[PDB]
């Protein structure tokens, strides 16, 4: 089974992603990884070393380990040293001071209590969204597989930021990605773009921060990934887990999501009609999933992100050392990370889709998986 | 690790739930199970046999197997026979006729293609929401554990059905459950109740069907279930998987969810203040989770359900046998199943919470787990 794991602290030496269970023969390079890491850095308001699992630009079949360096490591090499440091030397280092005032909205408080820590540092170092870089590295392998095996593309666009009027037009196609990635807020629609940029400008002036909604779209999927046989096998379950597990995400929808719940059955679903090469539909309210399976239509997954950067001077907290009232201090200064969150959602979607495809189509090498896919597609067409 | 699995077809002999990894010593009976199954039958518009794992009303520590009979089995005992039946005898049975016209919105089409079936019967039998009965049986064990180990209660109430004005007042407490369960639409609020009942009456008159939004609330949780250490360990990920995997669910939110994404950082989070016995908060926008962990506040999980019963004569489909146009025929006749969906969401929430509690607190018997919980609570209080 395809599996992924990330490791690293925000201010540690490096991050590591390991992907286990990918077939041999998938073409992927350090340059591909770096490119996706560059996309994760997009938005208005990462030295890669492949350590294992890839040879001469082709996966080997074994575990793929990717390291992502921390460029600021020299500043942190004592405070975040793996090995013991003389506590007296450490006592003279201002950077190593105690963080005992948890930020509302973050892991700090619950993580400190959970693990019995008197300092937020060990919590925030691992909880931080810097970890999504390691996710994106892993996701690159999944992306390559999906394209080479299935001709599938995963992209995203931003629906809303702050109080912007949500973009409710049709989703983009793959060929629209260059224009989206060139948008300061990775919007597909120019009117929504302007509205969102205005929201960011206003927040920036007010010294405030914003969240937003993003949509990942996966195109070209075969019918029948996921299953109806149990709750855990439904692809929507799997996608929900992968997307909700992203830092700052507080909601996930498939297709028209919560709006579908307000609609009558007569207008809620996607009717089917005859076509040359199979059943066709004129709507995709379902967002490409029915009964837990891909149905041939674009997969559409939406994620709601809370504002992720803490606001200066606004939020009351408690100094856990004393029990006294305090005010929370920020660790990040960006007004909005929604555009980049879209890229992270793409990654998580790709990983789940790749896993589901390997579950159905099997194989130990790409050529084998491809034969299996072709035979399945033939069997469907011959219906 | 606590694990659950369901088995059964809608018109098979019986359903089975198996729960593995529950501690010995939890008090739970067949009558408790039947009571929760009765709750699953609530809403305006199940013979239980415990086979293993419980002795004299106390769990044994091994796998708990619960069987739920199908009262209509005699009608289906040939059509759904496990063993071969003479195809000629079968050919004279109208009930065994082919279902080759997939219902929009259901598993039928994708499941037929996935598994190479020329009949929807094997798909709809397993995909059907009758399977949620087996979930509720399993969930009863989880509920008992949560109450006995942690004093935790899980309940639900309905937010909206069809185009009703959503209830956005405060959530109920445990002591409100009798009033909610006595409501025809399991609403906490009388004004919202009337609005929802009107929606159902209008749909019923029009020969249409409805979906809706429900909120599960879990009260009394300790701080620090779930973790920030990876995407899969975040409790919101786990809850999202469990809830989105329920039939007909198309969206999941934690706390204020998608609305949080429209708010500024200054008004999006729950500030902390000093209190006698620990940090206190005046808001719960987060819905009881921060950084993937319980934070002490009520857990609030919302689920969006599409309308789940097919509408007579409305939906075009295709006869897969011929390629000809057709109109979809329904398998269920209820206008709205939202109130009951709430009960199923409670179950899935309970199962995930019980699993997370056993992960942190360990133990093989309830008394052992309880000692571990008490010691943790003491250690927190002694901060
Ligand atoms: Na780590
Ligand atoms: Na190959
Ligand atoms: Na679409
Ligand atoms: Na079964
Ligand atoms: Na015990
Ligand atoms: Na609350």
XYZ file of C-alpha atoms and ligand atoms in Angstrom:
772
model
C 0.000 0.000 0.000
C 1.272 3.478 -0.759
C 2.247 5.228 2.510
C 3.863 8.585 3.345
C 5.465 10.024 6.387
C 7.050 13.357 7.192
C 9.608 14.213 9.826
C 11.331 17.419 10.920
C 11.087 20.488 13.099
C 10.598 23.999 11.607
C 14.000 25.138 12.867
C 15.685 21.759 12.810
C 18.505 20.804 10.447
C 16.262 19.463 7.702
C 12.909 17.889 6.918
C 12.492 14.371 5.553
C 9.670 12.798 3.546
C 9.544 9.036 3.035
C 7.173 7.446 0.458
C 6.796 3.642 0.703
C 4.915 1.376 -1.764
C 5.367 3.270 -5.035
C 5.972 1.140 -8.126
C 9.353 1.077 -9.884
C 9.670 2.962 -13.159
C 8.022 6.289 -12.368
C 10.019 9.193 -13.787
C 10.643 11.832 -11.149
C 13.654 14.067 -10.387
C 14.980 16.456 -7.734
C 14.099 19.283 -10.147
C 10.429 18.126 -10.149
C 10.429 18.196 -6.371
C 12.000 21.644 -6.237
C 9.462 22.942 -8.726
C 6.566 21.857 -6.505
C 8.274 23.325 -3.498
C 8.489 26.606 -5.447
C 4.726 26.466 -6.042
C 4.191 26.112 -2.292
C 5.950 29.502 -1.942
C 3.413 31.342 -4.182
C 1.034 34.001 -2.955
C 0.629 37.715 -2.357
C 0.159 38.275 1.388
C 14.232 24.394 0.180
C 17.424 22.619 -0.974
C 16.377 19.162 -2.016
C 18.399 15.983 -1.772
C 16.915 12.651 -2.901
C 18.551 10.119 -0.595
C 16.982 6.828 -1.675
C 14.493 5.091 -3.928
C 15.224 6.794 -7.225
C 18.008 5.995 -9.694
C 18.729 7.890 -12.903
C 15.359 9.655 -12.593
C 13.271 6.459 -12.208
C 11.814 5.050 -8.995
C 13.391 1.781 -7.816
C 10.365 0.316 -5.988
C 11.741 0.728 -2.480
C 11.266 3.528 0.003
C 11.870 7.027 -1.397
C 13.517 9.359 1.108
C 13.764 13.075 0.305
C 15.574 15.597 2.493
C 14.728 19.364 2.502
C 17.339 21.557 4.114
C 16.757 24.373 6.590
C 18.805 27.316 5.323
C 18.688 29.096 8.730
C 20.147 26.074 10.596
C 23.242 27.929 11.764
C 21.055 30.280 13.853
C 19.250 27.346 15.437
C 22.034 24.794 15.686
C 22.348 25.226 19.458
C 18.752 25.963 20.446
C 17.554 22.987 18.352
C 20.654 20.798 18.767
C 19.804 17.068 18.824
C 22.474 16.356 21.419
C 22.836 17.744 24.914
C 24.242 21.257 25.354
C 25.727 22.614 28.585
C 22.724 24.185 30.345
C 24.926 27.110 31.458
C 25.924 27.915 27.876
C 22.271 27.547 26.922
C 21.301 29.870 29.806
C 23.229 32.705 28.114
C 21.295 32.278 24.843
C 18.319 34.661 24.512
C 16.903 32.625 21.600
C 16.440 29.646 23.946
C 14.152 31.538 26.305
C 10.920 29.908 27.467
C 7.690 30.137 25.470
C 4.979 29.862 28.129
C 2.187 31.991 26.531
C 0.192 29.746 24.150
C -1.259 31.248 20.977
C -5.046 30.876 20.575
C -5.781 28.778 17.546
C -2.538 26.816 17.653
C -1.354 23.507 19.097
C 0.583 25.252 21.870
C -1.731 24.878 24.893
C -3.226 21.445 24.263
C 0.171 20.045 23.139
C 1.908 21.356 26.271
C -0.659 19.697 28.525
C -0.725 16.486 26.461
C 3.037 15.940 26.512
C 3.710 17.535 29.936
C 5.888 20.294 28.434
C 6.485 23.563 30.296
C 7.717 25.230 27.043
C 5.749 25.603 23.773
C 8.924 25.229 21.701
C 8.833 21.422 21.253
C 5.127 21.702 20.247
C 5.332 24.580 17.772
C 8.440 23.218 16.123
C 6.623 20.085 14.961
C 3.068 21.544 14.646
C 4.239 24.344 12.349
C 3.112 24.440 8.763
C 6.731 24.238 7.647
C 5.990 20.460 7.757
C 3.812 20.889 4.663
C 6.983 21.263 2.676
C 7.799 17.629 3.396
C 4.235 16.730 2.332
C 4.723 18.480 -0.994
C 7.950 16.586 -1.609
C 6.124 13.282 -1.094
C 3.206 14.471 -3.190
C 5.494 15.069 -6.175
C 6.051 11.329 -6.441
C 2.283 10.763 -6.294
C 1.746 13.397 -8.990
C 4.254 11.825 -11.334
C 2.642 8.446 -10.894
C -0.877 9.801 -11.565
C 0.236 11.549 -14.747
C 2.287 8.655 -16.128
C -0.105 5.858 -15.161
C -3.500 7.495 -15.601
C -3.016 10.820 -17.421
C -4.457 12.500 -14.330
C -3.659 16.127 -13.395
C -4.273 17.722 -10.002
C -4.615 21.488 -9.684
C -6.192 24.057 -7.388
C -7.632 27.532 -7.360
C -8.764 29.857 -4.641
C -12.517 30.342 -4.070
C -12.474 33.097 -1.404
C -10.167 34.953 0.993
C -11.617 36.833 3.946
C -14.978 38.415 3.097
C -14.513 38.188 -0.678
C -17.470 37.155 -2.847
C -16.801 33.462 -3.536
C -16.003 32.389 -7.068
C -18.784 30.064 -8.088
C -18.074 29.726 -11.792
C -16.798 26.543 -13.413
C -13.526 24.969 -12.330
C -10.317 25.384 -14.312
C -8.751 22.807 -16.597
C -5.101 21.762 -16.510
C -4.193 24.253 -19.245
C -5.342 27.067 -16.919
C -2.690 26.353 -14.296
C -0.084 28.810 -15.648
C -2.588 31.670 -15.385
C -3.672 30.582 -11.883
C -0.108 30.258 -10.599
C 0.621 33.760 -12.025
C -2.242 35.230 -10.039
C -1.174 36.881 -6.768
C -3.977 34.963 -5.012
C -4.042 31.910 -7.373
C -7.525 32.775 -8.581
C -9.001 31.469 -11.798
C -11.453 34.413 -12.088
C -10.299 38.027 -12.558
C -13.188 39.619 -10.658
C -12.695 37.316 -7.693
C -8.951 37.980 -7.882
C -9.455 41.725 -7.463
C -11.863 41.246 -4.600
C -9.447 38.918 -2.782
C -6.425 41.234 -3.305
C -8.527 44.065 -1.821
C -9.353 41.939 1.191
C -5.637 41.224 1.745
C -4.741 44.924 1.377
C -7.348 45.911 3.938
C -6.251 43.274 6.414
C -2.617 44.252 5.919
C -3.492 47.904 6.698
C -5.479 46.906 9.756
C -2.668 44.633 11.103
C -5.001 41.641 10.810
C -4.915 38.194 9.202
C -7.149 36.166 6.901
C -8.236 32.643 6.001
C -10.039 31.407 2.934
C -11.424 28.576 0.807
C -9.618 26.636 -1.875
C -10.687 23.974 -4.406
C -8.529 21.147 -5.676
C -9.566 19.609 -8.964
C -8.382 16.267 -10.278
C -8.985 15.565 -13.925
C -8.908 12.380 -16.017
C -9.696 9.823 -13.287
C -11.004 6.395 -14.216
C -14.352 5.217 -12.832
C -14.139 3.054 -9.739
C -11.363 4.264 -7.417
C -12.469 3.947 -3.801
C -15.282 1.584 -2.827
C -18.724 1.466 -1.278
C -17.862 -1.631 0.780
C -17.097 0.187 4.018
C -16.815 3.730 5.489
C -13.027 3.600 5.466
C -12.852 2.531 1.806
C -15.018 5.397 0.515
C -12.723 7.798 -1.341
C -14.463 10.785 0.231
C -13.531 9.494 3.689
C -9.902 9.089 2.649
C -9.768 12.527 0.999
C -11.418 14.144 4.005
C -8.822 12.636 6.351
C -5.924 13.773 4.122
C -7.226 17.328 3.657
C -8.577 17.968 7.181
C -5.183 16.873 8.569
C -3.551 19.885 6.938
C -2.683 22.617 9.404
C -5.422 25.255 9.857
C -8.087 23.391 7.851
C -11.502 23.461 9.627
C -13.801 22.138 6.865
C -13.828 19.899 3.800
C -16.487 19.493 1.053
C -16.836 17.248 -1.959
C -18.455 18.955 -4.943
C -21.236 21.311 -3.928
C -20.892 20.133 -0.320
C -22.898 22.032 2.282
C -24.994 23.691 -0.506
C -26.148 20.260 -1.678
C -27.685 19.799 1.788
C -29.967 22.778 1.097
C -31.224 21.463 -2.254
C -34.122 19.193 -3.211
C -33.433 15.721 -4.561
C -34.808 16.856 -7.903
C -31.935 19.374 -8.246
C -29.154 17.840 -6.064
C -27.655 15.074 -8.289
C -26.075 14.538 -11.674
C -28.366 12.889 -14.189
C -26.962 10.451 -16.723
C -27.440 10.382 -20.512
C -26.266 8.203 -23.428
C -23.083 9.100 -25.255
C -20.780 7.702 -27.924
C -18.224 6.192 -25.549
C -20.297 5.775 -22.380
C -22.679 7.554 -20.021
C -22.309 11.378 -19.947
C -23.537 14.039 -17.516
C -24.269 17.735 -17.835
C -23.660 18.649 -14.164
C -21.065 17.727 -11.524
C -22.729 18.602 -8.280
C -21.276 15.429 -6.761
C -17.706 16.650 -7.393
C -16.654 13.432 -9.157
C -17.611 10.976 -6.350
C -20.727 8.833 -5.854
C -21.106 6.079 -3.296
C -17.455 6.552 -2.346
C -16.054 6.034 -5.858
C -14.783 8.108 -8.732
C -17.522 8.423 -11.340
C -15.516 9.826 -14.283
C -16.282 13.514 -13.665
C -13.764 16.007 -12.281
C -12.991 15.433 -8.669
C -13.611 18.614 -6.671
C -12.486 18.916 -3.049
C -12.834 22.184 -1.113
C -11.054 23.086 2.047
C -11.725 25.904 4.556
C -8.609 27.425 6.179
C -8.803 29.528 9.346
C -6.433 32.407 9.602
C -3.149 30.726 10.492
C -0.943 33.730 11.456
C -1.530 35.167 14.910
C -2.649 38.853 15.184
C -0.341 41.224 17.199
C -1.784 42.536 20.551
C -5.313 41.239 20.004
C -5.501 37.905 21.705
C -5.628 37.400 25.405
C -3.880 34.319 26.674
C -2.444 32.998 29.989
C 1.190 32.637 31.086
C 1.183 29.003 32.101
C 4.251 29.595 34.269
C 2.417 32.087 36.524
C -1.320 31.811 35.772
C -1.308 35.492 34.879
C -3.058 37.139 32.015
C -0.995 37.827 28.915
C -1.171 38.696 25.270
C -0.161 36.232 22.560
C 2.885 36.835 20.365
C 3.077 35.709 16.778
C 5.534 33.298 15.159
C 4.591 34.084 11.552
C 3.918 37.464 9.949
C 2.096 36.724 6.688
C -1.410 38.101 6.311
C -2.755 35.172 4.216
C -1.461 31.720 3.236
C -4.542 30.533 1.325
C -2.963 30.357 -2.140
C -0.184 28.097 -0.857
C -2.698 26.035 1.168
C -4.254 25.183 -2.193
C -0.977 23.677 -3.331
C -0.787 21.603 -0.131
C -4.392 20.396 -0.702
C -3.395 19.287 -4.241
C -0.567 17.263 -2.704
C -2.778 15.486 -0.187
C -5.363 14.733 -2.894
C -2.650 13.338 -5.181
C -1.280 11.043 -2.439
C -4.747 9.578 -1.695
C -5.543 9.130 -5.406
C -2.244 7.428 -6.089
C -2.829 5.058 -3.140
C -6.346 4.251 -4.374
C -5.135 3.605 -7.907
C -2.424 1.210 -6.740
C -4.996 -0.589 -4.544
C -7.203 -1.308 -7.605
C -4.621 -1.723 -10.342
C -1.795 -3.343 -8.387
C 1.620 -3.885 -9.961
C 5.190 -3.556 -8.826
C 6.400 -1.614 -11.893
C 4.742 1.188 -13.814
C 4.515 -0.882 -17.012
C 2.661 -3.608 -15.085
C 0.236 -1.159 -13.473
C -0.308 0.399 -16.903
C -1.197 -2.942 -18.498
C -3.702 -3.522 -15.690
C -5.244 -0.104 -16.155
C -5.556 -0.600 -19.944
C -7.235 -3.978 -19.509
C -9.727 -2.515 -17.025
C -10.495 0.376 -19.392
C -10.995 -2.065 -22.256
C -13.333 -4.199 -20.153
C -15.417 -1.115 -19.354
C -15.450 0.070 -22.977
C -16.499 -3.412 -24.115
C -19.655 -3.075 -21.996
C -5.882 -0.138 18.860
C -9.655 0.092 18.866
C -11.016 -1.086 15.481
C -14.523 -1.640 14.077
C -15.891 -3.426 11.105
C -19.370 -3.952 9.730
C -20.661 -6.685 7.478
C -24.027 -7.457 5.889
C -26.300 -6.796 2.953
C -29.547 -4.768 3.319
C -31.676 -7.794 2.443
C -29.300 -10.435 3.722
C -29.976 -12.658 6.731
C -28.391 -10.341 9.278
C -25.802 -7.635 9.832
C -22.716 -8.072 12.000
C -20.560 -5.512 13.807
C -17.212 -6.527 15.288
C -15.322 -4.224 17.720
C -11.699 -5.232 18.452
C -9.370 -3.628 21.054
C -11.854 -2.510 23.712
C -10.737 -2.934 27.322
C -12.326 -5.526 29.620
C -14.749 -4.289 32.261
C -16.959 -1.898 30.308
C -20.620 -2.337 31.227
C -22.761 -2.726 28.132
C -25.816 -4.896 27.357
C -28.003 -6.008 24.444
C -30.649 -3.607 25.796
C -28.170 -0.687 25.440
C -27.541 -1.689 21.851
C -31.240 -1.981 21.076
C -31.872 1.420 22.611
C -29.353 3.063 20.276
C -30.795 1.201 17.350
C -34.195 2.640 18.340
C -32.704 6.147 18.251
C -31.488 5.493 14.706
C -35.169 4.953 13.777
C -36.245 8.468 14.930
C -37.487 11.175 12.613
C -40.568 12.628 10.966
C -40.202 12.224 7.189
C -33.419 -4.810 14.675
C -33.280 -7.972 16.832
C -29.944 -7.909 18.563
C -27.824 -10.868 19.565
C -24.446 -10.345 21.264
C -22.382 -13.299 20.073
C -18.997 -12.698 21.699
C -16.869 -10.427 23.844
C -19.294 -9.618 26.630
C -20.116 -11.727 29.690
C -22.695 -10.868 32.340
C -22.910 -7.320 30.951
C -19.139 -6.617 31.072
C -16.710 -6.650 28.152
C -14.163 -9.492 28.214
C -11.323 -7.753 26.330
C -11.591 -9.807 23.156
C -13.475 -9.110 19.963
C -17.123 -8.097 20.446
C -19.412 -9.478 17.748
C -23.007 -8.231 17.544
C -25.589 -9.609 15.123
C -28.653 -7.580 13.937
C -31.358 -9.634 12.296
C -33.215 -8.833 9.087
C -36.903 -9.345 9.859
C -37.839 -9.566 6.136
C -35.344 -12.405 5.460
C -38.015 -14.888 4.420
C -38.896 -12.692 1.408
C -35.253 -12.482 0.377
C -33.997 -15.919 1.344
C -33.818 -17.081 -2.280
C -32.893 -13.858 -4.072
C -30.124 -13.211 -1.505
C -29.289 -16.855 -0.736
C -25.583 -17.360 0.067
C -25.511 -20.711 -1.702
C -26.264 -21.520 -5.316
C -29.902 -21.724 -6.427
C -31.115 -23.483 -9.577
C -31.033 -20.724 -12.216
C -34.330 -22.028 -13.658
C -36.102 -21.685 -10.309
C -34.514 -18.256 -9.977
C -35.701 -17.382 -13.510
C -39.323 -17.707 -12.327
C -38.778 -15.219 -9.475
C -39.823 -11.643 -10.354
C -37.966 -10.262 -7.309
C -34.668 -11.484 -8.802
C -35.046 -9.424 -11.964
C -32.097 -7.374 -13.211
C -31.404 -3.842 -11.978
C -29.608 -2.212 -14.912
C -30.726 1.456 -14.491
C -28.357 3.145 -11.997
C -29.724 5.821 -9.672
C -27.979 9.219 -9.884
C -26.354 9.998 -6.588
C -25.835 6.385 -5.563
C -23.051 3.811 -5.813
C -24.875 1.899 -8.552
C -23.079 3.040 -11.730
C -19.512 3.403 -10.477
C -19.787 0.174 -8.413
C -21.075 -1.801 -11.410
C -18.161 -0.657 -13.560
C -15.618 -1.118 -10.750
C -16.590 -4.707 -9.961
C -17.664 -5.706 -13.505
C -21.281 -6.334 -12.437
C -24.121 -6.278 -14.974
C -26.703 -5.945 -12.127
C -26.867 -3.158 -9.499
C -28.153 -5.584 -6.858
C -24.767 -6.661 -5.418
C -23.751 -2.953 -5.222
C -26.880 -1.497 -3.627
C -27.171 -4.310 -1.131
C -23.847 -3.411 0.485
C -23.828 0.372 -0.264
C -27.232 0.881 1.360
C -27.533 2.903 4.517
C -28.974 -0.125 6.289
C -25.256 -0.759 7.074
C -25.356 2.190 9.483
C -27.300 -0.005 11.839
C -24.211 -2.159 12.294
C -22.199 1.041 12.892
C -24.577 2.092 15.649
C -24.246 -1.288 17.334
C -20.457 -0.893 17.411
C -20.770 2.707 18.534
C -22.752 1.656 21.611
C -19.646 -0.034 22.979
C -17.633 3.133 22.304
C -20.292 5.236 24.038
C -20.286 3.082 27.139
C -16.528 3.279 27.345
C -16.493 7.091 26.967
C -19.088 7.539 29.704
C -17.534 5.090 32.169
C -13.899 6.042 31.577
C -14.126 9.774 30.926
C -17.646 10.951 31.832
C -18.031 11.977 28.192
C -21.443 12.224 26.470
C -22.019 12.393 22.718
C -25.223 13.884 21.334
C -26.501 15.547 18.178
C -29.066 18.007 16.945
C -30.221 19.073 13.537
C -29.083 22.465 12.178
C -31.097 22.630 8.920
C -33.235 20.524 6.574
C -33.821 21.662 3.007
C -34.086 25.456 2.765
C -34.756 25.985 6.478
C -33.063 28.892 8.267
C -30.122 27.233 10.043
C -30.113 27.110 13.817
C -27.114 29.113 14.903
C -27.766 29.364 18.624
C -25.692 27.583 21.254
C -25.356 23.808 21.257
C -27.350 21.593 23.605
C -26.059 19.933 26.750
C -26.530 16.266 27.620
C -29.632 17.029 29.694
C -31.294 18.381 26.523
C -31.209 15.037 24.723
C -34.692 13.881 25.811
C -36.242 17.030 24.327
C -34.195 16.691 21.115
C -35.064 13.020 20.643
C -38.768 13.928 21.173
C -38.609 16.465 18.374
C -39.917 15.170 15.030
C -36.768 16.575 13.378
C -34.422 16.247 16.426
C -34.059 20.007 16.695
C -32.892 21.772 19.818
C -34.639 25.052 18.844
C -38.436 25.355 18.520
C -38.393 27.981 15.763
C -35.966 25.956 13.676
C -38.065 22.855 14.361
C -41.168 24.456 12.856
C -39.269 25.689 9.839
C -37.783 22.234 9.196
C -41.151 20.430 9.616
C -42.608 22.875 7.060
C -39.817 22.087 4.640
C -40.526 18.345 4.990
C -44.281 18.883 4.498
C -43.680 20.871 1.333
C -41.279 18.322 -0.090
C -43.675 15.508 0.777
C -46.483 17.315 -1.110
C -44.244 17.941 -4.093
C -43.049 14.276 -4.234
C -39.491 15.453 -3.572
C -36.711 14.651 -1.101
C -34.428 16.607 1.214
C -30.991 16.646 2.822
C -29.732 18.688 5.725
C -27.026 19.562 8.250
C -26.476 18.008 11.642
C -24.120 18.763 14.560
C -22.649 16.211 16.922
C -21.458 17.520 20.256
C -19.149 15.684 22.622
C -18.947 16.981 26.148
C -16.488 16.408 29.003
C -13.374 15.517 26.973
C -9.942 15.795 28.542
C -7.314 18.041 26.941
C -4.881 16.282 24.644
C -6.634 13.556 22.630
C -5.252 13.465 19.097
C -1.842 14.942 18.304
C -0.104 17.586 16.241
C 2.728 15.207 15.296
C 1.381 14.250 11.882
C -1.654 14.790 9.582
C -3.024 11.337 10.333
C -2.799 11.812 14.114
C -4.771 15.080 14.159
C -8.176 14.322 15.681
C -9.900 16.470 13.066
C -8.467 14.257 10.320
C -9.714 11.130 12.077
C -13.169 12.614 12.728
C -13.430 13.831 9.147
C -12.658 10.346 7.814
C -15.225 8.720 10.142
C -18.006 11.216 9.379
C -17.409 11.694 5.628
C -17.497 7.888 5.235
C -21.151 7.874 6.257
C -23.503 7.341 3.345
C -24.725 10.575 1.699
C -22.368 12.895 3.613
C -20.768 15.516 1.290
C -19.181 17.893 3.838
C -17.713 17.996 7.337
C -16.808 21.003 9.555
C -15.199 21.380 12.947
C -16.650 24.224 15.007
C -17.499 27.249 12.899
C -15.911 25.563 9.873
C -16.361 27.304 6.531
C -17.547 30.509 8.332
C -14.215 30.713 10.159
C -12.563 31.004 6.728
C -14.483 34.252 6.154
C -13.418 35.852 9.448
C -10.411 37.960 10.437
C -7.798 36.538 12.781
C -8.894 39.066 15.380
C -12.353 37.416 15.546
C -11.660 33.800 14.410
C -10.160 32.121 17.537
C -10.915 31.435 21.170
C -8.991 33.628 23.574
C -7.807 32.230 26.889
C -8.252 33.666 30.400
C -7.280 32.666 33.961
C -9.670 30.593 36.027
C -9.801 28.770 39.350
C -9.006 25.313 37.983
C -7.237 26.181 34.723
C -7.476 28.288 31.575
C -11.056 29.221 30.534
C -12.529 30.564 27.291
C -15.633 32.554 26.455
C -16.023 31.317 22.849
C -15.725 27.950 21.081
C -15.269 28.865 17.473
C -12.699 26.074 17.165
C -15.313 23.437 18.084
C -13.147 21.885 20.817
C -10.044 21.159 18.656
C -6.800 23.113 18.199
C -3.700 21.834 16.460
C -5.383 18.443 16.103
C -6.107 17.958 19.818
C -9.001 18.291 22.203
C -8.691 21.574 24.081
C -11.280 21.036 26.848
C -14.193 22.801 25.123
C -17.172 20.994 23.600
C -16.297 19.123 20.484
C -18.556 20.211 17.619
C -18.606 18.315 14.320
C -21.062 19.203 11.541
C -21.994 17.044 8.636
C -23.812 17.916 5.378
C -26.107 15.178 4.002
C -27.348 15.201 0.403
C -30.826 13.963 -0.187
C -30.433 10.195 0.031
C -33.829 8.955 -1.292
C -34.262 9.031 -5.053
C -37.098 11.206 -6.518
C -39.771 9.376 -8.642
C -39.774 10.209 -12.430
C -37.324 13.103 -12.207
C -33.931 11.688 -12.944
C -32.749 10.628 -16.326
C -30.423 7.671 -16.369
C -29.188 5.032 -18.880
C -30.085 1.337 -19.153
C -26.619 -0.156 -19.127
C -27.958 -3.312 -20.774
C -29.073 -1.432 -23.917
C -27.499 2.050 -23.816
C -30.986 3.520 -23.969
C -32.310 6.429 -22.030
C -34.306 5.643 -18.910
C -35.688 7.083 -15.734
C -34.358 6.079 -12.320
C -36.497 4.130 -9.851
C -36.214 4.552 -6.122
C -35.298 1.964 -3.487
C -36.298 4.058 -0.466
C -39.376 6.238 0.008
C -38.592 8.516 2.957
C -38.529 12.244 2.298
C -35.745 13.039 4.826
C -33.319 10.977 6.926
C -31.392 13.874 8.489
C -32.486 13.332 12.100
C -31.301 9.716 12.010
C -28.087 10.740 10.196
C -27.325 12.768 13.319
C -27.459 9.616 15.402
C -25.077 7.878 12.976
C -22.681 10.877 13.183
C -22.719 10.565 17.011
C -21.721 6.917 16.626
C -18.792 7.630 14.325
C -17.596 10.442 16.614
C -17.819 8.146 19.651
C -15.784 5.395 17.933
C -12.969 7.825 16.993
C -12.933 9.400 20.476
C -12.816 6.038 22.187
C -9.910 4.967 19.937
C -8.030 8.202 20.678
C -8.569 7.852 24.413
C -7.257 4.284 24.456
C -4.226 5.402 22.399
C -3.274 7.981 25.081
C -4.412 6.256 28.254
C -3.700 2.631 27.364
C -4.837 -0.203 29.623
C -6.325 -3.620 29.115
C -9.111 -3.225 31.707
C -11.339 -0.265 32.458
C -9.970 0.111 36.001
C -6.433 0.342 34.581
C -7.396 2.916 31.949
C -9.216 4.861 34.667
C -6.148 4.971 36.918
C -4.129 6.273 33.963
C -6.692 8.940 33.193
C -6.817 10.083 36.851
C -3.034 10.342 37.048
C -2.922 12.407 33.848
C -5.661 14.715 35.160
C -3.788 15.121 38.437
C -0.563 15.941 36.601
C -2.382 18.641 34.627
C -4.100 20.053 37.722
C -0.758 20.136 39.551
C 0.562 22.520 36.879
Na 9.911 15.277 13.571
Na 8.210 0.221 -15.685
Na -16.783 20.090 -12.491
Na -21.054 -7.617 3.706
Na -12.169 -3.209 35.124
Na -19.711 25.147 22.137
